[PDB]
């Protein structure tokens, strides 16, 4: 039973630079009939895989020219030269020489770009939500890079703990930024005990922390 | 062109059977292999096996020897996967993919069917406007959205203005809270000038619970 190894697991590259994902294999992928049945797929965030390369070194139709594959026997490279924003995704090698066909573990290609500062927003809970008996406050950080961002909640100028949640998007396919949401969740009663709600964002792009807030019942 | 369109999300108790389908079009169905690939959350793809629709015959990879079957309906060009006596290990996304036999590789893939195995009962979301704060009077870009709250299982599907507003939209990964349930937000950015022009509806479908909801997001 063959093993199909990919390196790295995670490959940061900047735009225009070249990228090498490699894929080793426990045993030769040459069929006794003469061919090598090594292929590559790209799986973009959320989507189903895309056919890239077949039989080691062939671009599938529609696949741009800056993707190329090579190698022989046990060692294969996929090279994306002049990398672009939409090359973002997970690359898998697939062998079907020996039964049974197998996938590498995938390499996550990450785009490196210049720092970009977040646009910060805040949304009070909706009337509708209150009616049902809870308050959720949402703080949006839009279009930033790098991923790292410290989001803090001040409720009436007191810091909060373990009562909010963060979610981050995958890297953007055109500009390679991230977006994030922090959600403070209080009970309707708790929410009404206070008046000022604020998320303060700290981030590499900001020369000093930006605070967004509101007073209740606006 | 070649299209493989698979059936919706499924929620099944452990021990039950599931049957997922995959309808093919835009080519001679019987002439190409049909492969099935498993994808557990954040994990790599796994090749389960294929059915040869010209002989009706199935091959499975070692792990999927056992509780797994492939079926065909050539007349209707559909292929099926059936898993039975379901376990939590089966919670995953399942892909059918056309097997282009001339080079021994899958070329066209279905969009993926997501199956949750859980002892727990479907719970449908509540949807709340995340209402924009920028007065239409002033400049810049304003932000707005929907809080899709307290549902199980994954996934829910958010679109805006019936999928005719896609630019500037961010639908966040679902996240868990101590309740055992999921929540997310879909936000969009728009010129503040247009908030007093035209309307913004977010359209949330959650199929395991049969909730389709539209929410008018406004000041
Ligand atoms: C090894 C062998 O005899 C060959 C004959 C036909 C080949 C199969 C043809 C269909 C096919 C399509 C795929 O996408 C995976 C590889 C497979 C599953 C092939 C694997 C190797 C097979 C099974």
Closest C-alpha to B6, from B24, B31, B33, B26: B24
Are B112 and B132 part of one and the same domain? no
Distance CA(A84)–CA(A63), nearest Å, equals 13
Are B112 and B161 part of one and the same domain? no
Strand order in the sheet with B211-217: B157-160, B200-206, B211-217
Element of type H or E holding A41:
strand A38-43
Which atom of ligand 1 is nearest the CA belonging to B97? 14
Could B108 and A168 be called an inter-chain contact, meaning their C-beta atoms sit closer than 8 Å? Answer: no
Show which of B62, B88, B119 is a domain's final residue. B119
The protein residue with its alpha carbon nearest to ligand 1, atom 7, reads: B104
Distances (CA, A) of A104 to A60, A96, A185: 19, 12, 41
State whether the Cα torsion B157-B160-B166-B171 is positive or negative.
Answer: negative
Domain extent, residue B55, equals 1-119
Element of type H or E holding A128:
helix A127-132
Are B82 and B147 part of one and the same domain? no
Distance CA(A123)–CA(A213), nearest Å, equals 9
Q: Under a CB-based contact definition with an 8 Å cutoff, are residues A91 and A110 in contact?
A: no
Are B141 and B198 part of one and the same domain? yes
Is the previous residue joined to A146 through a cis bond, with omega within 30 degrees of 0? yes
Contact residues for B55 (Cβ-Cβ < 8 A; gap 6+): none
CA A38 from centroid of its chain's CA atoms: 26
Distance CA(B161)–CA(B214), nearest Å, equals 9
Could A138 and B185 be called an inter-chain contact, meaning their C-beta atoms sit closer than 8 Å? Answer: yes
Structural domain count of chain B = 2
Burial zone of A163 (CB within 10 Å; 0-12 exposed, 13-18 middle, 19+ buried)? middle
* C-alpha torsion A168→A170→A175→A179, nearest 10: -10
How many beta carbons lie within 10 A of that of residue B157, not counting itself?
16
CA B145 from centroid of its chain's CA atoms: 21
Contact residues for B21 (Cβ-Cβ < 8 A; gap 6+): B6, B7, B78, B79, B80, B81
Q: Under a CB-based contact definition with an 8 Å cutoff, are residues A156 and A196 in contact?
A: yes
Q: How many CB pairs lie under 8 A apart between chains A and B?
A: 117
Could A123 and B61 be called an inter-chain contact, meaning their C-beta atoms sit closer than 8 Å? Answer: no
Distance CA(A107)–CA(B44), nearest Å, equals 9
B3 HSE (CA, 13 A, CB side): 6
Q: From the list B95, B105, B170, which residue is nearest A39 (CB)?
A: B105
Length of chain B: 219
Strand pairing report for B3-6 and B18-25 = antiparallel
Could A128 and B128 be called an inter-chain contact, meaning their C-beta atoms sit closer than 8 Å? Answer: yes
Distance CA(B151)–CA(A142), nearest Å, equals 25
Distances (CA, A) of A179 to A138, A166, A172, A211, B212: 13, 11, 9, 17, 26
CA B44 from centroid of its chain's CA atoms: 17
Which atom of ligand 1 is nearest the CA belonging to A37? 16
Are B146 and B110 part of one and the same domain? no
Show which of B90, B119, B148 is a domain's final residue. B119
Are B172 and B193 part of one and the same domain? yes
CATH number at residue B112: 2.60.40.10
Q: A43 — contact with chain B (CB < 8 Å)?
A: yes
Strand pairing report for A89-95 and A102-103 = antiparallel
Are B74 and B38 part of one and the same domain? yes
Are B188 and B124 part of one and the same domain? yes
Q: Under a CB-based contact definition with an 8 Å cutoff, are residues B196 and B218 in contact?
A: no
Considering only the C-alpha atoms of chain A, give the largest distance between any 2 of them, rounded to a whole number of Å: 76
DSSP secondary structure letters along B93-132: EEEEEEEETTTTEEEEE---EEEEE-SSPPB--EEEEE--
Burial zone of B87 (CB within 10 Å; 0-12 exposed, 13-18 middle, 19+ buried)? exposed
The protein residue with its alpha carbon nearest to ligand 1, atom 1, reads: A99
Q: Under a CB-based contact definition with an 8 Å cutoff, are residues B108 and B95 in contact?
A: no
Distance CA(B158)–CA(B175), nearest Å, equals 15
Distance CA(B16)–CA(B9), nearest Å, equals 15
Which atom of ligand 1 is nearest the CA belonging to A31? 1
Could B45 and A169 be called an inter-chain contact, meaning their C-beta atoms sit closer than 8 Å? Answer: no
Could A94 and B126 be called an inter-chain contact, meaning their C-beta atoms sit closer than 8 Å? Answer: no
Closest C-alpha to B90, from B51, B52, B36, B50: B36
Angle at Cα A111 formed by Cα A105 and Cα A117, nearest 5°?
A: 135
Q: Under a CB-based contact definition with an 8 Å cutoff, are residues A77 and A7 in contact?
A: no
Q: Under a CB-based contact definition with an 8 Å cutoff, are residues B188 and B165 in contact?
A: yes
**Chain A residue closest to B95 (CA)?**
A48
Within 8 A of A179 by CB-CB distance, chain B residues are 170, 172, 187
Contact residues for B99 (Cβ-Cβ < 8 A; gap 6+): B32, B33, B34, B35, B50, B105, B106
Distance CA(A154)–CA(A211), nearest Å, equals 10
Q: B187 — contact with chain A (CB < 8 Å)?
A: yes
Are B61 and B140 part of one and the same domain? no
DSSP state of A49: P
Element of type H or E holding A188:
helix A188-192
Are B38 and B140 part of one and the same domain? no
Within 8 A of B172 by CB-CB distance, chain A residues are 167-169, 179, 181
Could B170 and A142 be called an inter-chain contact, meaning their C-beta atoms sit closer than 8 Å? Answer: yes
Compute, in angstroms, the gap from residue B1 CA to the centroid of ligand 1.
Answer: 23
Is residue A85 classed as helix, strand or coil in its secondary structure?
Answer: helix
Beta bridge partners of A155: A158, A197
What domains does chain A contain, in order, with CATH numbers?
1-112 (2.60.40.10), 113-216 (2.60.40.10)
Show which of B96, B119, B142 is a domain's final residue. B119
**Chain B residue closest to A31 (CA)?**
B104
The protein residue with its alpha carbon nearest to ligand 1, atom 2, reads: A99
Mutate to test the interface with A, among B35, B44, B218 (most CBs of A within 10 A): B44
- Category of A89 on φ-ψ map: left (φ > 0), alpha (ψ -120 to 50) or beta: left
Element of type H or E holding A192:
helix A188-192
Compute, in angstroms, the gap from residue A73 CA to the centroid of ligand 1.
Answer: 19
Are B103 and B140 part of one and the same domain? no
- In angstroms, the separation between the Cα of residue A16 and the nearest Cα of chain B is 25
Provide the experimental method for this PDB entry: X-ray
Closest C-alpha to A164, from B183, B187, B186, B157: B183
Is the previous residue joined to B155 through a cis bond, with omega within 30 degrees of 0? yes
- In angstroms, the separation between the Cα of residue B46 and the nearest Cα of chain A is 6
How many beta carbons lie within 10 A of that of residue A55, not counting itself?
17
Gyration radius from chain A CA atoms? 24
Contact residues for A207 (Cβ-Cβ < 8 A; gap 6+): none
Distance CA(B60)–CA(A28), nearest Å, equals 22
Within 8 A of A48 by CB-CB distance, chain B residues are 95, 109-112
Element of type H or E holding A189:
helix A188-192
Helix (H) and strand (E) counts in chain A: 2, 19
Interface of A with B in 67-106 (CB under 8 A): 92, 94, 96-97, 99-106
Beta bridge partners of A152: A200
Are B106 and B64 part of one and the same domain? yes
DSSP secondary structure letters along chain B: --EEEE---EEE-TT--EEEEEEEESS-GGGSEEEEEEE-TTS--EEEEEEETTTTEEEE-GGGSSSEEEEEEGGGTEEEEEE-S--GGG-EEEEEEEEETTTTEEEEE---EEEEE-SSPPB--EEEEE---S-TTS-SEEEEEEEEEEEBSS--EEEETTTT--TTEEEPPPEE-TTS-EEEEEEEEEEGGGTTTS-EEEEEEETTTTEEEEEEE--
Ligand 1 site residues (CB inside 6 A) read A 96, 99, 101; B 33, 35, 50, 99, 101, 104-106
Strand order in the sheet with B18-25: B3-6, B18-25, B78-83, B68-73
How many beta carbons lie within 10 A of that of residue B177, not counting itself?
15
What Å resolution does this PDB entry report?
Answer: 2.8
Is residue A29 classed as helix, strand or coil in its secondary structure?
Answer: coil
Burial zone of B209 (CB within 10 Å; 0-12 exposed, 13-18 middle, 19+ buried)? middle
Compute, in angstroms, the gap from residue B59 CA to the centroid of ligand 1.
Answer: 10
């Amino acid at each position: 039973e063959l093993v199909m190894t990919q390196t790295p697991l995670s490959l940061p590259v900047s735009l225009g630079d070249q990228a090498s994902i490699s894929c080793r294999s426990s045993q030769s992928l040459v069929h006794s009939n003469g061919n090598t049945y090594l292929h590559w797929y790209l799986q973009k965030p959320g989507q189903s895989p895309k056919f890239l390369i077949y039989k080691v070194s062939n671009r599938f139709s529609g696949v741009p020219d800056r993707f190329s594959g090579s190698g022989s026997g046990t060692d294969f490279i996929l090279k994306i030269s002049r990398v672009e924003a939409e090359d973002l995704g997970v690359y898998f090698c697939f062998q079907s020489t020996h039964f049974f066909p197998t996938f590498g573990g995938g390499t996550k290609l990450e785009i490196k770009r210049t720092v970009a500062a977040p646009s910060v927003f805040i949304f009070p809970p909706s009337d509708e939500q209150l009616k049902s008996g809870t308050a959720s406050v949402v703080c949006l950080l839009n279009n930033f890079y790098p991923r790292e961002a410290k989001v803090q909640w001040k409720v009436d100028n007191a810091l909060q703990s373990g009562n909010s949640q963060e979610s981050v998007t995958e890297q953007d396919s055109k500009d390679s930024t991230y977006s994030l949401s922090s959600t403070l969740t209080l009970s309707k009663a708790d929410y009404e005990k206070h008046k000022v709600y604020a998320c303060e964002v700290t981030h590499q792009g900001l020369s000093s922390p930006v605070t967004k807030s509101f007073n209740r019942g606006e | 062109q070649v299209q493989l369109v698979q059936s919706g999300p499924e929620l099944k108790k452990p021990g039950e059977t599931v049957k997922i389908s995959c309808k093919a079009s835009g080519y001679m169905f019987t002439n190409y292999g049909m492969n099935w690939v498993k994808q557990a959350p954040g994990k790599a793809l796994k090749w389960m096996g294929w059915i040869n629709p010209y002989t009706g015959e199935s091959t499975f990879a070692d792990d999927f020897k056992g509780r797994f079957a492939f079926f065909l309906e050539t007349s209707a060009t559909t292929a099926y996967l059936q898993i039975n006596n379901l376990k939590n290990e089966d919670t995953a996304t399942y892909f059918c993919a056309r097997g282009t036999t001339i080079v021994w590789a899958m070329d066209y893939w279905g969009q993926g069917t997501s199956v949750t195995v859980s002892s727990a009962s479907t719970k449908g979301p509540s949807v709340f406007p995340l209402a924009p704060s920028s007065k239409s009077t002033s400049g810049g870009t304003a932000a707005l959205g929907c809080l899709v709250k307290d549902y199980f299982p994954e996934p829910v599907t958010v679109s805006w203005n019936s999928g005719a507003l896609t630019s500037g939209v961010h639908t966040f990964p679902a996240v868990l809270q101590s309740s055992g349930l999921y929540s997310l937000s879909s936000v969009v950015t728009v010129p503040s000038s247009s908030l007093g022009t035209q309307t913004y509806i977010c359209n949330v479908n959650h199929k395991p619970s049969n909730t389709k909801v539209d929410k008018k997001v406004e000041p």
